[PDB]
């Protein structure tokens, strides 16, 4: 295959790395190699950039596809079922370390959706329905908040009768009925006081 002497390592968004052929392959192009979660993916392409498409198959016959944008600022990882056509998951990582990951149900609807900000905090949506509603959970540096999702806004709440909420809408609004690095406040138990 490709190793330390016959390739060059290229850093990709999402802390992935890809190896590229030295000069050129047998029939014109450059060869690409990237290992993602125990599974190494093979791909051919021109450009010698690190950009291109790499594919692979898991032990459970699931198909994996990894496309790297031309400017190398975006990464798309798709997992398909055995038919290579039913989408199981699709994750798009950006150069600024932010990402969106969609998980599809057996009908082809987004049933779970994870949004990772550049700071590392995550916004997780589970049990999404065709209504546009579901469960909402914000993962923070230290604690977890749990709440509900509506097609309108996102409400997160911590609970005596002193139980106040946290609202994030379609856009980047954040109203409270706050920090830019998303938090002074500290950890989970300590929210109930103020």
């Amino acid at each position, epitope marked *: 295959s490709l190793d330390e002497k016959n390739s060059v390592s290229v850093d990709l968004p999402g802390e992935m790395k890809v190896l590229v052929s030295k000069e050129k392959n047998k029939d014109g192009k450059y060869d690409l190699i990237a290992t993602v979660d125990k599974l190494e993916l093979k791909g051919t392409s021109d450009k010698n950039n690190g950009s291109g498409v790499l594919e692979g198959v898991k032990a459970d016959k699931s198909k994996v596809k990894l496309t790297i944008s031309d400017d190398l600022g975006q990464t798309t990882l798709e997992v398909f079922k055995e038919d290579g*056509k039913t989408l199981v998951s699709k994750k798009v990582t950006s150069k600024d370390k932010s990402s969106t990951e969609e998980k*599809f149900n057996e009908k082809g609807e987004v049933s779970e959706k994870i949004i990772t900000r550049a700071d590392g905090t995550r916004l997780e949506y589970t049990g999404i329905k065709s209504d546009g509603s579901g469960k909402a959970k914000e993962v923070l540096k230290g604690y977890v908040l749990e709440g509900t999702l509506t097609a309108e806004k996102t409400t997160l709440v911590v609970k005596g009768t002193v139980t106040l909420s946290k609202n994030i809408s379609k856009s980047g609004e954040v109203s409270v009925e706050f920090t830019k690095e998303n938090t002074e406040i500290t950890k989970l138990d300590e929210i109930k006081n103020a």
Partner: antibody
Amino acid sequence: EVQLVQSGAEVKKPGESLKISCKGSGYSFTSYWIGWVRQMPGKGLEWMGIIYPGDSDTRYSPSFQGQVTISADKSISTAYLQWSSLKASDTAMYYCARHLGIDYFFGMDVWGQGTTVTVSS
Amino acid sequence: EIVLTQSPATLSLSPGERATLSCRASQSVSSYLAWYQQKPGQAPRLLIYDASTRDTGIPARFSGSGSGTDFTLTISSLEPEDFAVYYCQHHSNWYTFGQGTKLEIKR
């Protein structure tokens, strides 16, 4: 070996009801959406709607909502397209096709051979 | 609504030549664009989905590219059986098909 076979050509009169059928072979019929597509004589293709035969979840295009009923018999891998009162303007070719994805979309990858419906007095 | 526009309405070429077909969307849209071929008296056949991946059995001379607003179907060198109507279809607007491009023989 993956295929969809539609019922034969129909010559009907206006007002009559009609139910045409689409049978799947070679794959898990209840694991995929089945869609219906219209092509009027000399015209392009029109997406009408889809059904998930696993639980008969049905989604219609706003252009065809209330004009047709799409149904499915999960136990014999058959989807159906029906009218209760045919119009002359319903004269067209109708295709069923396997529809890939709701919140993603990979196109319609398997097609029936089509069914001609002629509606005349 | 998001509207698809295929250009040109009629593309007149000959076997051996390169063919480029355009689909443009009135707004920036996702990659979920599919291309179909339909010959007279036949059912449509899927050629490309997700803008750039070829369906099973489709010959290598067909390829798709594009993003945002501009999408292209390219036929590297036309064969006689490639002369047909071509349709695009996107996820938006309830999976609406484009109006179609007729690829005819130039004489």
